[PDB]
Design a protein around this ligand. Structure first.
Ligand SMILES: N[C@H](CCC(=O)N[C@@H](CS)C(=O)NCC(=O)O)C(=O)O
Ligand SMILES: CCCCCC/C=C\CCCCCCCC(=O)O
Ligand SMILES: CCCCCC/C=C\CCCCCCCC(=O)O
Ligand SMILES: CCCCCC/C=C\CCCCCCCC(=O)O
Ligand SMILES: CCCCCC/C=C\CCCCCCCC(=O)O
Ligand SMILES: CCCCCC/C=C\CCCCCCCC(=O)O
Ligand SMILES: CCCCCC/C=C\CCCCCCCC(=O)O
Ligand SMILES: CCCCCC/C=C\CCCCCCCC(=O)O
Ligand SMILES: CCCCCC/C=C\CCCCCCCC(=O)O
Ligand SMILES: CCCCCC/C=C\CCCCCCCC(=O)O
Ligand SMILES: CCCCCC/C=C\CCCCCCCC(=O)O
Ligand SMILES: CCCCCC/C=C\CCCCCCCC(=O)O
Ligand SMILES: CCCCCC/C=C\CCCCCCCC(=O)O
Ligand code: NI
Ligand code: NI
Ligand code: NI
Ligand code: NI
Ligand code: NI
Ligand code: NI
Ligand code: NI
Ligand code: NI
Ligand code: NI
Ligand code: NI
Ligand code: NI
Ligand code: NI
Lengths: 150, 150, 150, 150, 150, 150, 150, 150, 150, 150, 150, 150
């Protein structure tokens, strides 16, 4: 405190962030479950293809999760909160489908992997466009001021 | 600048965040050390069970680390900073114990894994409760206003 | 809204964050490419050393990426934005070199790994120094006030 | 010779038989092609999953091919030639789809495997019904004649 | 059509043929069942000895099945239909016992393998004797006619 | 019975069929012999290359055997019995050479594999030409009758 | 010495003991022989299933041999010498059959394994019954004497 | 017979011996059970770590069992029956704990392994002390008698 | 008690027995030491040949140890105590040499293995000769008494 | 210098030597090429049979190359330069054929291996015959001179 | 003897030859050392990549060593002694660097491998040029004399 | 020609060289023989330890053979022919013993390996001493002449 809160500017991003965490928790619980079913004890991460697909689907989602969080917040702050949150939901729903598909079949990971890549690339473009709108005017002005005497 | 800083609202979260990073650095240095001791050179991540346990303990802590960070910040902003920071410390101390236990024995990972899951689930619940307190009143009001003419 | 934005206080951190994401995207696309070249289909993450090095270089960069993001933001907020952003650029350029080197040879990962560790440790020290400057004066004052009657 | 030919009673069965052979030839040429692509030389029948799927799809089609031929001819002679030939075409088209699907993905073999099983079971039932119509009347008559004095 | 059918000359052969197909169907369903029980997914044909024995028993029966069909029909047409059908039943019952025995133990395959070989060799001898009775008289006559002038 | 036999129309096909069976029996006895020599007990089908070549040569001959039988009978009935029987003998002699060559060396399988493929493709073409001669005239007539009013 | 010998009280146990040793010697000589035949040199204890079965049959007999000796002597001293010696002979003859069966086939070990377990359990029960007869009367008397005043 | 029995001098040793046998029987039944659960058929003694731990725990107990029996009897006869029997019970209870611990985790074998070693070493020391008391006086006397003339 | 002890009749056997136990303890401590040196953790019993030789030497000594104990006691009681004890010492010294040799080289196990076999076979022959002297006179007398009337 | 050169006595040997070196260079370049084609990177010398055959053919030629050089020079100096050079050319041409054959097929190495062995054995015999002509006369003379007085 | 020595014409070649031998001795001692460090006992030539690189570097140097010696002597005799000796030193220094580099990293073998190939190819060209100068004039003269009458 | 031969100065070196070649031929024939006995076909160089020891013993002798030849000739020319030839015989006899020993046991290679190293090091020292005697006087003279004016 402060007699103002910036919570109302990031609450959709925070909600989509928490949903992402819950989805990652779900993937982790499904791996523990596959370990039980296929009797693959730590420290092993190999076993039958069906176990390896569940393990790998979770590990893939986990590798991309910080990329998702980073670009969600940057796009949400610099471009538009609602648009970023919406691309974020689409990304997470695609990730659920990727995990479910990949667990059934390596080939079934591909369609939802492409949908998740499209949603993440869109977050990347919105983040980039917002950062450009932030930096470009001051930079072009400073260049122009430089050329002004001449 | 700005003639105000929101640093004083997130400094415990930032301190617990930095402690988390230092702990992850420690786990990484312990893997490099196990590589030396067991002569397992990159790109290999397999070798004797004792090397694999150290590798896996670090990789597990690393997978969950962004989940920890995400929920720490959301709970700290939307619920209560001190409570979030405290659950965060408990989580990180549990993770230290998980890493140390798992390195000695797969079975010794389990008790501290459960303690870390309890602390992370508590962060999740506090984040959820704070987001509910943020969104629910405006939503119930809007629903009611809708029903008002009738 | 709010009639003020804290965007101007974190825009360099956000830009370096987005660059980090783009670099991680690049590493991921290079793994997909190595999968094609060496015919290593998911769920496999093993194959010839040359494939394993590309896979491992990406996975290593990915493990450290949240540590990078965490300390970049904490150092940028609590110490100095421009200094944090600069150490961050140096870190990311070192990571590019690590990935390129490791793909050619395990041994070629080492020099740029050390440069990335130096840049990350510097971010850690700046974050720590900023948090100390935040907390230490109030703590020493409170200790002193305690001793004052005596 | 003979001043009659029974060719006109089995020409659809013979045509569907020849189509089956051509389809098996196709599967064999696709395995030779996969051997070239994946550099798997005889006597090896193992290699990457993608090679093994092509090999296995052909071997599976080959195991069932004599079952197909046997029941096609028995159903065609004892039940109805056109019906047997039609179930036979459906079976072979399902087998093409099984081979193509299985080569892409183990999971993609399943739908067309079920369609081929339905067509083969139908040939089995028609063969059984025709053999029953052949044998049952004489058998029931002989049983009855036996009971007649009494 | 034709105002005569040759169905009555091959109906026992066709019935024994259909029984052979049903038995091969049974072996195939037992392999699918062993895949489920031992979690061996296609394209794999290896796993624990107990799975491999079920797989191999089916594959062995399948390799010999066209030899069985070929000699059943040739012996049934050229020697005697009832005798061929009877040796055929004995062969198929021996094959059932081979499959059941081999699934329990490699060693238990041997006694019924020998009984199936005896029944198949008998079909071979009957086929050979019928073909000799078909060709030998005309050949000896033609040789004699050749020697007749001299 | 019947006061006529169609045996005299298929006796060369039946003789070549029986020779094919005897040749497959020979290949099977040679595998049992290689099992003894190299001490490879069922359910194993792997061992030294020299055992695997004998196993594979037999399995290859067995996969193609129903294709051989099918096309031999269709070409023999629809095209010309003596021509089909002759291509059939050539095919079987090529298969003997394939088995003997492959057992000595993978590379030695190739020349006789090509000779067997040429003989089998010739049977396929004769079968196709006979089926065309059977079906084409009635089909062209029916098409023409259709066009006749116009 | 002593002007008495307790040899006459244990000579059947000693004879059955010596027979057990000779049988274990036989099993050991058969393993050395299997090593020669299958060319499996120490320190290896793995090789083809046929070698492993001979090795394992001997190792199993060896693990149970001290259990046999212990219970033979305890039953022979505390229950009845002739009965213990007789169960002991039955056990050893069952063990010979177990070794011979297991060497031929894993499955053939089972019937004689069960017969050896029945004979060993009988020795266990006789030993237990003899020890009960030894200890129970004095214990029940001491309990009763305790209750006597009351 | 004999009008005396030495049964009363060894009945505690015999009872502890029989308990040892029953405990070894228990370990063996637990291995058979682990074979069923993990589908590891003889002659295999390898499989998942969880099966191998149960197998190894039993094999370890079995290797030491004759050492236990030997020293139990020697200490019980030459030192003191009750003391030997008591160390023996402690040893066997420690072995139960070793088996149960090792089955859960390799690391959990260690504490009860040390307790079993302490109890076995104590039996060894009591056996040694009893044998010294038996042999030393006569030996020192004989040495002294030798020195006596001088 | 008893006013006599049979300790003086078996004290050399008991001493040689205890020495055997101490030697087995030594072999076990050397395996634990090889586990440390070669980093082979339980439940593994495989690793480099040098570890496997130490493991196997101990396991071999352990398998034969109950055979040694059994025949030592039977020969010592039924033939001559001092002779049995002496063959026993020779056997144990040969076993020490076997363990030391085998640890250095598989081939170095052979000479001392043969010396241990000679000493054990001698114990076997002395045990057999003592049991014959025990049983043969009464048996020949009983046979003769049977023949006496005639 | 010297006002004479012994170059004219060994120039054919030197030319055949240089040709041998060029041929070994060729074999080495073909291995580097096979490494590229089959993606087998150093330090690996294993991979598909087709790579291993190229590697092994070169390594075999390399092992025998010093034997070739040694005997070429000794035969060329002690027997006859032109004859040695000619056997040497024949040997090298046989080695080219061995390398080319072995690369295609293990079996194709054999005929040219035998031709190279014949040429090398001939060089050996010429070297031996030349050394005999050098040493035998002086030795027989010295023996004779020894016998001369007598 | 001889009242002249050709030692002064080859002493630099002999010195460079001896240096080559000493360098090969060094490589061999470094392999023995790597065997000790990585516990890889003969007959094994495989182990961790770091051991395999040391082994392979030595084996590669050894394969090329006779090519080096052959061309060093031929170039030194037929072209120029000092030039050959100098290229030889350069080659050997490059080989030292190849061995040292390859031991650290496969990739580090490449630069010095290329330098050694350049020095060896230069020796080859000098040897070829010297042999041409030896043979070409007499050959061109003989061809010309042949053409002279015409 | 030349009216002198330098054959009489190198005939012992040539004879020892030829003996070395014959010994290498023997080692090669023994490997071909081990391939037959253990059924290890090219391109394989792995199999049971007993085959690998024969292979490795030959390959080791082959690697050192050019070192032997080089130093034999240099020591024989620059130091003393008879001494070099004698060390050479000793070396070759040691190599025979190394091959024979290593084939029986890895450990048995060591004593004769050391004897061969001593003989080869002696050849190295004699070669070095002869080259020093060749070069040192002229070098010291040239240095002295340089210092002479001063
Ligand atoms: N290096 C030996 C020498 C014995 C030899 O030269 N064998 C001939 C006939 S089996 C061969 O072609 N060896 C094949 C190879 O060296 O890869 C070997 O491994 O075989
Ligand atoms: C747990 C998930 C929370 C969901 C957060 C998003 C809630 C509603 C998002 C929709 C906002 C859309 C704003 C309009 C964007 C546009 O114009 O495209
Ligand atoms: C590096 C670690 C920094 C530690 C950050 C936390 C410092 C004190 C945390 C305690 C705050 C507790 C506030 C009260 C919460 C409650 O009522 O439960
Ligand atoms: C995509 C990358 C964006 C780059 C963000 C950084 C842009 C300029 C950074 C330089 C700021 C340096 C401020 C001075 C720091 C110092 O004094 O050391
Ligand atoms: C190569 C393929 C040849 C095709 C053989 C079949 C040609 C036409 C088949 C259709 C006949 C259908 C007859 C009617 C059967 C019914 O009433 O269901
Ligand atoms: C599904 C199985 C159908 C059974 C076909 C056979 C039915 C009866 C076969 C017996 C015919 C025997 C004829 C006599 C042969 C002989 O004399 O040996
Ligand atoms: C066991 C093998 C039986 C052999 C069957 C064939 C017997 C003779 C076949 C030759 C018939 C050739 C007829 C002429 C064909 C043509 O004109 O090309
Ligand atoms: C080498 C083997 C020695 C055999 C030892 C046993 C000799 C005879 C044993 C039979 C004794 C049976 C006594 C009667 C037991 C009963 O009543 O059941
Ligand atoms: C099946 C187990 C049987 C148990 C055997 C032991 C029964 C009681 C043992 C206790 C005897 C203790 C005697 C005193 C020893 C001492 O003074 O320390
Ligand atoms: C720990 C080892 C204890 C040693 C036990 C043996 C002590 C002396 C044994 C020698 C007794 C020899 C008696 C004579 C035997 C004979 O005549 O051959
Ligand atoms: C690069 C290769 C150089 C070739 C060296 C040989 C050149 C000609 C060799 C033939 C000399 C033959 C002399 C006659 C030998 C004989 O009588 O058999
Ligand atoms: C152990 C190494 C011995 C070194 C042998 C070489 C000693 C000096 C070599 C230099 C000779 C160079 C002669 C000039 C060659 C040229 O003109 O290029
Ligand atoms: C095939 C082997 C040929 C043997 C070559 C050597 C023949 C005799 C060598 C002995 C010469 C010894 C000369 C004396 C050396 C010295 O004084 O030590
Ligand atoms: Ni205020
Ligand atoms: Ni201001
Ligand atoms: Ni603000
Ligand atoms: Ni406002
Ligand atoms: Ni007619
Ligand atoms: Ni009629
Ligand atoms: Ni008809
Ligand atoms: Ni009495
Ligand atoms: Ni007594
Ligand atoms: Ni001069
Ligand atoms: Ni000269
Ligand atoms: Ni002179």
């Amino acid at each position: 405190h402060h007699h103002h809160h910036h919570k109302d500017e990031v609450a959709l991003l925070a909600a989509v962030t928490l949903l992402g965490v819950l989805l990652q928790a779900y993937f982790s619980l499904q791996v523990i479950s596959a370990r039980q079913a296929f009797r693959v004890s730590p420290p092993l991460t190999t076993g039958p293809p069906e176990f390896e697909r569940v393990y790998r689907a979770q590990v893939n989602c986990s590798e991309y999760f910080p990329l998702f969080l980073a670009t969600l917040w940057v796009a949400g702050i610099f471009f538009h909160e609602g648009a970023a949150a919406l691309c974020g939901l689409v990304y997470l729903f695609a990730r659920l489908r990727y995990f479910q598909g990949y667990a059934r079949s390596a080939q079934l990971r591909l369609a939802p992997l492409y949908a998740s890549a499209r949603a993440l690339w869109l977050l990347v473009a919105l983040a980039a466009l917002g950062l450009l709108a932030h930096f470009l005017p001051a930079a072009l002005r400073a260049a122009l001021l430089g050329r002004l005497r001449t």
